[PDB]
Design a protein around this ligand. Structure first.
Ligand SMILES: NC(=O)c1ccc[n+]([C@@H]2O[C@H](COP(=O)([O-])OP(=O)(O)OC[C@H]3O[C@@H](n4cnc5c(N)ncnc54)[C@H](O)[C@@H]3O)[C@@H](O)[C@H]2O)c1
Ligand SMILES: NC(=O)c1ccc[n+]([C@@H]2O[C@H](COP(=O)([O-])OP(=O)(O)OC[C@H]3O[C@@H](n4cnc5c(N)ncnc54)[C@H](O)[C@@H]3O)[C@@H](O)[C@H]2O)c1
Ligand SMILES: NC(=O)c1ccc[n+]([C@@H]2O[C@H](COP(=O)([O-])OP(=O)(O)OC[C@H]3O[C@@H](n4cnc5c(N)ncnc54)[C@H](O)[C@@H]3O)[C@@H](O)[C@H]2O)c1
Lengths: 513, 513, 513
């Protein structure tokens, strides 16, 4: 633990009221066409609620690969289970999680002159993942022990320990619209609500399920996470999905271009729970976003940045920030789970391909020294279904680049990654950060500020962009896709609630003496 | 171009006098063992000399692979030469250079709400690489056109254009101490000064050469860069190399444990020119550093971070900052130039292995959540001599990591990199940044400050750490090895001389509205 | 099953007496320097003993990685055990074995015109691996269940089934000469016979152990296989190891340059059991071979061709037989078992490096169109100890080649191979083929041949060369290292005992009609 010694930071047993000075640079164009840089300061008052709630996560796709892996891993970490591998004994951990497995720099030691590093989870009052309750919906009624055996992700020794408690968990019936997921997912749907079309009864039932989850479990806050199959893009039609009331009427009129995910998101917005989409499909259409802003409900980005895309975000940033001109990026993946079986259809593969292909455009528009306006590298993404490899995704990347005097650099990467074991800690990170963001309020520093001036963060949580492949940002704002930039954004926003200045890495006390 | 509109920044035609507030966090231990974080502010006055000098670089190892590549590339960029490749026409560029091929963010647009990115070279008044004069010493008297043909790095079409002017360049005689480089480099030395041992006449001759370079060329500033063969570690002996006067006496007494690089560095310190070591050997012993601090001469780090080590700095940082526990790093390189031939000896390979192996220790000591005190991954580095591959170094990396619930991640990387084409822009970056650092002065902001209170940066230039594999820091300070951290340090130090605040990446104007 | 309908093949319930015509080509130099090719025919009589013996294998290094894996796998296949993996249910098999997992072509169908393929194990009367008895010596007294847990090769579910029967197996004490294996293997030796030097009592004890194994178990034939640590090369000294009697005197005189493996081989030759060396060290010195020929004892080659070397034998053959000039071969391996720990010493790594480096010389001497006399590619082999990877050896190969008009081909291979699971079926293959070779006799076809003219194959079994990295051939004969050639040799020699002609692959009945 640590505390901040500053007149600007006031600690109360319920609140961490703090004063912060946001310092930025504003650029305006001069008369002769040159740029003028002006330092700007905005004084902000931040309020952080110290009380930790009893948090529940509702998973849409509970019986999937990722959902079963999560519920098993939370049980394993909560009980401190030790199991047997060929190498010997294995203990439960939260590796692969930036919040639960990484540290950030607090400051420099006065005496030793060395850096003080504290866990990322300990910066702000945050909910511990061991106490997270899981539930939700699935079109397949298989219990989560049998779902665990279907997934083929976990070792038999661990499954033996977690099977007794995971056999009592059965997902609630969900909604199946046949048009949106692949034709080979017909035989999977046995636990489905009455109706293959879009209706207002589905919204009522989903709201009832969220209510009953919170009531029966005894939870203070609920979060809904979409971990279901990738869907096809729902066409944007004027009068159907372009406005909150238009969409609310389209649900009742039973229009044939409303995704199941949109029904879940609408139910979440009407019940006041945050909704995070873990799939590349366009769950939030114009009208879902406006309904979220009209009600004050928090909504997150799309997809999960776990594996080849995370390393791509690191590498493209590193290579373009070093002066190497990337001309080709070729991503090849083949996998043999139900995720790859659903993406074997073109209409459902297109969404994932679009999500994977749009991670490098911001980095190539930032480097105007290498890339001319309109110059983009050849970015190809291929995903194939190989049933024999199972959950072990094999990714092959070829990065082709141009260097000094026309030289050629080629970087070939072979990644053997367990998909579910790389996305589960991301879900933990998403829920923990979203719960924290529901507990932070802000206002402008005035000499007569009242309690009525407290405001929340914008309904679209871009602070989750570290864990999201296709970040969703507030309407009209740019998108940040660099991994280091997103991690720094999260860390510095967390430090701003403590009145601490952002990390600059200059270290002038070691250079000027 | 751009200008800063701020009362703290005053622009004169010769100076950029600016006022900056260095904001950091200081950590002190409380009585009950907890940590206390206190915001600290140090007010600094920075003075930047706007006048650009005529800069000359003296290369020790001019006829090597890297030196010939540099002199050819500077000619190619200066003349704007276009040559023929199989793919068609190729123009000269400075790709692979962070200063000449990358951009940094200046600020946000007032109207568009989009980011303004300006070239890294345009942030501060900096010397253009097209105007850099080259010269120096080599033990081989071959002219640099024949040295270019010996190197086997450049295409015949480019060599045809640059051969006429590169055949008039002949390196000055150098000093050859047989004990320090490999036994297979005996036949290479034909241009050597009289003497196989350490003497004060060598210092006189090297100082004379630096003087004559500056006088004949008409230069305002000179920088010496060691681009010669990797040397063996010179033993630290009390009374020989532990003190500036002890070392100055050891040169005259002709002790047998003084490297040729130490003679070059001593000559540079006595003539007031900066010296940058581009090799893993310990050029600066205790006594060379003290002589540098006693005279005010600037000295740089060791080795060149070009290729597998740069990507290692990116990847290890990315993986450990994401919660993945690296257990094994295995670097394999084989190459067939004179660099690999000199490293075929164990005593000269040890220095490069030590330099390559110490890039990840700071990242594993920062993450106390994953690594216990004393826990280090298995880091192996292998370098082999394969004459058939030439300058094209083939690097194979295996990163083995532990992830959620005991999962295994393996990342296999095959890099085919032209060594000389990845290190030449690094040399340009080093000389440009070092020249700029010779033009920056600092002081503490007082109400009665005088002109006599202006001070330079510390003699050990750690701001070059981005381009250096084994960064040398001021005595008693920690070492930063993360690539993103070093680039951010350079950018934020450059912005501090303009009175601008460091980049925080928070973007609160897009989240709070 | 199948039978041969031919007057040349006579089937008896105990013998398969057959007549074969060995057809080859002989080359003699003409007067004008040209070559003359003459067809030669040698008529051979082959006798194959149909009776299958009760076979026992004695392993030197029983408690090692490979020995424990073998004894466990034989139990698993014998009992037909099914265990649990993450993917589901796994049954026992003999995959990775050329005899037990591959087929050979018997002939063409008269009616269908399609090929008839029969299992390699069914060509000749051969011992089934399910009935093989295991035993032997080890310097470590740990039982083989605890040795199995030490090895970290097998899944916990399989180990649970095999642990009860593998805990009753304890290796006999062995002989430890400290000079020959690495200094870090001191603490491993607790089950050692009295004596750190070479003595005749060791031969008596080893012979007693072989006798008692056969007597107690009730076996008809015994084979000894060296699966112990790699040793250093024993110097060839005149009067010590250059003659059978010289070596027999050197054992008694206690010379300090006689390997432990030589003592085992000598004991085997004096007891009449075959000895196969599975390590790169020179077990058979001049004098051991002569003793083998003087007694009639069978001795095999050196090392195990399992993994990167097998693929190297395939690839180098394929590339050089296709017209591609290999200029560089770079093999990198790192592993973390006791094998890699013993090879961390230079004197013990040299033997493995020599064994791995000499697999391509025969292929480059066969292609006189590409390689001039004395032209050899750059062949580098690196083996490193990385304790974190365990038995999973990571091999990285770079094959660099020259193609049409000076083009460059590069082939980069990343192999993740379980070392013990690739060498265990090789040991099964070696013992099965060696037992068969002890049951085959030959003679020249004469009109008055008697029973006294029956002869055995030469004491040095080169027919095992498929499974051996460093093939040992009869003194004065060339070595075959191509994998396809060795497999074809084995198949055609097996078919020659059946009176069948070698496979030619011409298929003229489908081309001439
Ligand atoms: N590395 C990763 O695992 C990763 C990374 C990025 C994105 N994603 C995305 O996350 C999602 C989950 O991946 P997975 O491998 O766990 O999936 P999966 O293939 O196991 O299927 C998800 C589950 O959702 C269920 N489902 C489908 N439609 C439903 C509906 N309308 N209501 C309720 N349940 C429904 C399916 O029956 C299935 O059990 C996918 O969309 C995938 O594309 C995964
Ligand atoms: N990617 C890279 O190229 C890279 C990266 C990191 C470090 N380095 C280091 O940079 C240096 C230059 O590499 P290179 O491939 O150009 O080297 P190289 O093999 O071509 O040899 C450098 C030159 O220095 C000369 N030399 C040696 N001792 C000398 C002395 N006392 N005085 C004058 N000249 C002397 C040699 O004759 C040779 O011509 C090496 O030490 C190398 O280890 C290179
Ligand atoms: N893929 C492979 O596994 C492979 C391939 C080629 C060659 N080999 C060779 O096969 C051998 C076995 O490999 P491993 O990984 O099973 O070995 P290992 O590292 O497990 O050690 C072999 C065993 O032999 C024992 N031993 C050593 N000296 C002995 C002696 N004098 N008498 C009795 N026991 C003795 C050791 O204590 C150890 O238990 C090694 O020499 C290895 O180099 C293995």
């Amino acid at each position: 633990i640590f505390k901040v010694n500053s007149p600007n930071v006031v600690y109360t047993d319920d609140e961490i009221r703090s004063k912060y000075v946001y310092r930025t640079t504003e650029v305006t164009t001069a008369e002769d066409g040159s740029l003028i840089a002006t330092p700007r300061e905005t004084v902000y008052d931040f309020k952080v609620d110290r009380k930790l709630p009893k948090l529940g996560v509702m998973l849409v796709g509970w019986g999937g690969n990722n959902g079963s892996t999560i519920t098993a891993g939370i049980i394993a970490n909560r009980r401190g289970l030790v199991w047997e591998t060929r190498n010997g004994k294995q203990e439960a951990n939260y590796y692969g999680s930036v919040i639960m497995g990484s540290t950030i720099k607090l400051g420099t030691d006065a005496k030793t002159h060395k850096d003080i590093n504290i866990p990322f989870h300990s910066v702000l009052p945050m909910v511990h993942p061991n106490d997270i309750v899981i539930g939700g919906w699935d079109i397949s009624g298989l219990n989560l022990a049998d779902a665990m055996d279907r997934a083929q992700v976990l070792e038999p020794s661990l499954k033996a320990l977690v099977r007794k408690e995971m056999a009592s968990m059965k997902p609630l019936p969900s909604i199946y619209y046949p048009d949106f997921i692949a034709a080979n997912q017909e035989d999977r749907a046995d636990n489905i609500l009455p109706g293959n079309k879009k209706c207002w009864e589905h919204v009522e039932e989903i709201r009832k399920n969220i209510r009953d989850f919170k009531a029966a479990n005894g939870l203070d806050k609920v979060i809904v996470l979409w971990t279901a199959n990738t869907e096809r893009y729902a066409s944007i039609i004027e009068g159907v999905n372009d406005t909150a009331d238009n969409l609310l009427n389209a649900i009742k009129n039973g229009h044939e271009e409303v995704s199941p995910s949109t029904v879940f998101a609408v139910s979440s917005i009407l019940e006041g729970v945050p909704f995070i989409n873990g799939s590349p499909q366009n769950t939030f259409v114009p009208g879902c976003i406006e309904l979220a802003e009209r009600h004050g409900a928090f909504i997150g980005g799309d997809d999960f940045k776990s594996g080849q895309t995370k390393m791509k975000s690191a590498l493209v940033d590193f290579l373009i920030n070093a002066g190497i001109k990337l001309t080709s990026i070729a991503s090849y993946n083949h996998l043999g789970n139900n995720d790859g079986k659903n993406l074997s259809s073109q209409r459902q593969f297109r969404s994932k391909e679009i999500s994977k292909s749009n991670v490098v455009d911001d980095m190539v528009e930032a480097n105007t020294v290498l890339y001319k306006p309109g110059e983009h590298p050849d970015h190809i993404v291929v995903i194939k279904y190989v049933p024999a490899v199972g959950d072990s995704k094999r990714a092959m990347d070829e990065y082709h680049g141009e260097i000094f005097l026309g030289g050629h650099q080629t970087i070939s990467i072979a990644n053997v990654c367990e998909d579910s074991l790389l996305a589960s800690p991301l879900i933990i990170d998403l829920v923990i950060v979203a719960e924290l963001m529901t507990r932070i309020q802000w206002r402008l520093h005035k000499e007569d500020a009242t309690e009525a001036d407290w405001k929340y963060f914008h309904s679209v949580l871009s602070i989750l962009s570290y864990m999201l492949k296709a970040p969703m940002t507030p309407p009209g704002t740019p998108v940040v896709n660099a991994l280091a930039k997103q991690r720094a954004a999260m860390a510095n926003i967390f430090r701003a609630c403590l009145g601490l200045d952002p990390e600059n890495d200059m270290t002038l006390e070691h250079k000027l003496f």
